């Protein structure tokens, strides 16, 4: 019975940033539009395709 998790109705405001964390960095640009064939294929030296 003393081991049961209990509810507490406190008046103290819930800490907005308890860890005092710094601003997280902006994510890298995610994906893009559709895939299209390579402009000239494998442009590896003499290969044309």
């Amino acid at each position: 019975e003393l081991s049961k998790v209990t509810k507490v109705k406190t008046d103290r405001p819930l800490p907005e940033n308890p860890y005092h964390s710094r601003a997280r960095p902006e994510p890298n640009p995610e994906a893009e539009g559709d895939l299209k064939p390579a402009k000239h294929g494998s442009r590896l030296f003499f290969w044309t395709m």
Binding site: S42, L44, W47, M49
Partner: protein
């Protein structure tokens, strides 16, 4: 050794390598390396010989030292970072120690000494396994940590590997020792581009694996371990020695054979990184590898050494064993240069 036991040991070696290539925890990678060593020693000593025992002891000693240094580096990285993931190492000293250990596992010079001795001691099958499959796990670990790899140290080790491999191969007469020194040189080539582009290392590794598989299988088919014993092959099976000539030329890298692909792409990537002196020296030193390959080709098929009278009896009988992969491996290791744009698949 019972065949079931041998299959279990081979699968254990493979599983160790797979664990090294599958794990995300440093401890598990070290565990995989330890499993590889444990299941590799009996395979090396499948045919009980004093030379085989000496080779096994030397191999165990070297790999054990490497594993000790690797675990020490892992522990130091844990101490300075509290991380177990196989990512950017956060301590330079640990990075250096780990590089030394992994190079010792690969056989890069100046940790090359054990490779020729162990290769000569063990059988051709064990030599094949040691020089092809055992090269996968340390290369995988190096590829994963390539970002943290000190370019100077790795480049020095790779260049020394190429030089020493060529020089050692020039003086050898035993086929296994020639193969081992050539392996050292090829590993130098593989690790040279590791700081720059890992996919090129993967490409060189695959081509090297195919070439070494073909060469070792041809040696096993001809059952020859010395230059003269291979020279006798022309009388019995000329096809095998001619295909050996082709594979040797590919190992030298002479175009338009497959061996040109890895060197070409490696030079491309190194030049893209504004390094011109290093690749030039690399190719100029690979000329020595070409020299000993050409000497072997001379003795094997380009010229005909004297044979023995007993060869007549061997002429009558035909090889019973059939290595299924050998034809495909020969083709893939000789004629694949028109297929470089397939490099993208590796990415």
């Amino acid at each position: 050794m019972n065949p079931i036991i041998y299959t279990t040991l081979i699968m254990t070696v493979m599983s160790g390598t797979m664990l090294v290539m599958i794990s995300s925890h440093w401890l598990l990678i070290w565990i995989g390396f330890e499993m590889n060593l444990l299941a590799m020693i009996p395979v090396l000593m499948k045919n009980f010989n004093p030379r085989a025992t000496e080779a096994a002891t030397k191999y165990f000693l070297t790999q054990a030292t490497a594993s000790m240094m690797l675990m020490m580096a892992i522990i130091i990285n844990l101490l300075y970072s509290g991380q177990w993931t196989i990512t950017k190492m956060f301590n330079p000293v640990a990075m250096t120690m780990m590089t030394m250990a992994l190079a010792m596992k690969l056989g890069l010079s100046p940790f090359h000494f054990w490779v020729p001795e162990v290769t000569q001691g063990i059988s051709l099958q064990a030599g094949l396994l040691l020089l092809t499959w055992q090269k996968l796990a340390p290369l995988s670990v190096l590829c994963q940590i390539s970002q943290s790899i000190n370019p100077n140290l790795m480049l020095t080790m790779a260049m020394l590997s190429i030089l020493i491999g060529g020089w050692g191969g020039l003086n050898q007469t035993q086929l296994r020792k020639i193969m081992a020194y050539s392996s050292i040189a090829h590993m130098g080539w593989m690790t040279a581009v590791l700081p720059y582009n890992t996919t090129m290392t993967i490409l060189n590794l695959l081509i090297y694996i195919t070439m070494t598989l073909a060469m070792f299988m041809l040696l096993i088919h001809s059952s020859a371990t010395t230059t003269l014993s291979l020279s006798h092959t022309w009388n019995k099976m000329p096809v095998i020695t001619s295909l050996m000539m082709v594979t040797l030329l590919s190992m030298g890298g002479l175009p338009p054979l497959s061996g040109f692909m890895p060197k070409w792409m490696i030079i491309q990537e190194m030049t893209k990184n504004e390094s011109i002196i290093m690749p030039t020296l690399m190719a100029m030193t690979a000329l020595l590898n070409l020299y000993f390959y050409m000497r072997l080709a001379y003795s094997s098929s380009l010229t005909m050494f004297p044979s023995t009278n007993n060869m007549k009896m061997k002429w009558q009988f035909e090889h019973t064993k059939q290595m299924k992969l050998l034809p495909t491996m020969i083709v893939l290791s000789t004629l694949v240069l028109p297929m470089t744009p397939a490099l993208s698949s590796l990415n």
